[model samples]
Target: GSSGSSGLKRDFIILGNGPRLQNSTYQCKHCDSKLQSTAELTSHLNIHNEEFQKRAKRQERRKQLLSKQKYADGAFADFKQESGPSSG
Candidate 1:
């Protein structure tokens, strides 16, 4: 009796016994859409794929920017250490 919701008005229930799959279907808990299999459900969920990809790419870019900033900070620190007033 594994059942849960995806928080997007979508819920899934697993109808099977152990390793056997019987009448296992994924459907939108708040809609009339039903999928025959996991793959089909996955594909169906891709209706929001474009927006998801946009958000994913934005996050990736943010991570890359943070990485670059860290590198720049380390490089600047090294530069300052090497160019600082002579201790001699």
Candidate 2:
């Protein structure tokens, strides 16, 4: 007795005569997140961990720019010394 189903659907549903059907599961590397679908887990793992540092630095720069109305005559001279094509 056989019924025809698409290959992908068969892959997700077929089981080796077990109580549970074959299903995919995944866990996140950075947090307690989990997903039942392989695609969902792959997407979730791309999220940044808590230790990602750029957010803190960006917040500090934003606060500084908001408070600064003027710069000293020589305040930014050292900036030019370190400036390069990649620097903002």
Candidate 3:
């Protein structure tokens, strides 16, 4: 059996403005995940690409898939934390 339930959302860390520095990091163009990190973006980017290819493989949209679809060309780059002005 599963260790945890999946039907409902589980309690995550950090409760009510607990006390942490949560600055904006990266966001997926696939439009879903957000405030993620480069590592996270990198991971999820592949995820989206996988789904994308599965959806449109050998179609006329190959160009768009590669050109427009950043994920196609491994153009994975939504959130790049640089000079994070805030580091306490």
Candidate 4:
């Protein structure tokens, strides 16, 4: 018969655990907005892509704004059609 137990400290540690948020979070860079979640973040960015961020479309839209007086009264005349002025 033998019975001898000394001071033995045994501890177990788990590593599968993860982490989460703190204080600062996500936001919109193009606009001054304090975002809460990604739910609306994706939507806000979508509006930009369709509005101006687009390539071919943006260039077409930007060209009108570019150059000093590249477009004016004489330029806008192209929009008119002399259809006998039937509208009065």
**Number of the top-ranking candidate, with TM-score as the measure:** 3
Q: For model 3, how does the per-residue alpha-carbon lDDT over 1-88 read when each residue is reduced to its tens digit?
A: 7596558667768546567765786756777556567877778778777888788656664444443222222356555434334434
- Expressed as tens digits, the lDDT of each residue in 1-88 for candidate 1 is 5997566567789674487554667765434566788787766777667656775653433432332222224633354333444446
Order of candidate numbers by lDDT, starting with the best: 3, 4, 1, 2
Q: For every model shown, what is its TM-score relative to the native structure?
A: 0.26, 0.27, 0.35, 0.30
Which sections of candidate 1 miss by over 4 Å?
1-22, 51-88
lDDT of 3: 0.62
lDDT of 2 by residue, 2-71 (tens): 8876655433564455586534655555575557886786666555643465545545334323432333
lDDT per residue as tens, model 4, 1-88: 5987789899998665358543455667777665667877888779878867454342433333443222224454365343343343
Judge candidate 1 at residue 11 and give its lDDT.
75
Off by over 4 Å in 3: 1-22, 57-88
Error of 2 at 29 (Å): 2.3
Lowest summed lDDT across 10 adjacent residues in model 3 is found at 65-74
Per-residue lDDT, model 3, residue 77, is 55
TM-score of model 3 vs. true structure: 0.35
Task: State each candidate's clash count.
Answer: 0, 0, 1, 0
Give the TM-score comparing model 1 with the true structure, all chains together.
Answer: 0.26
Better of 2 and 4 by lDDT: 4
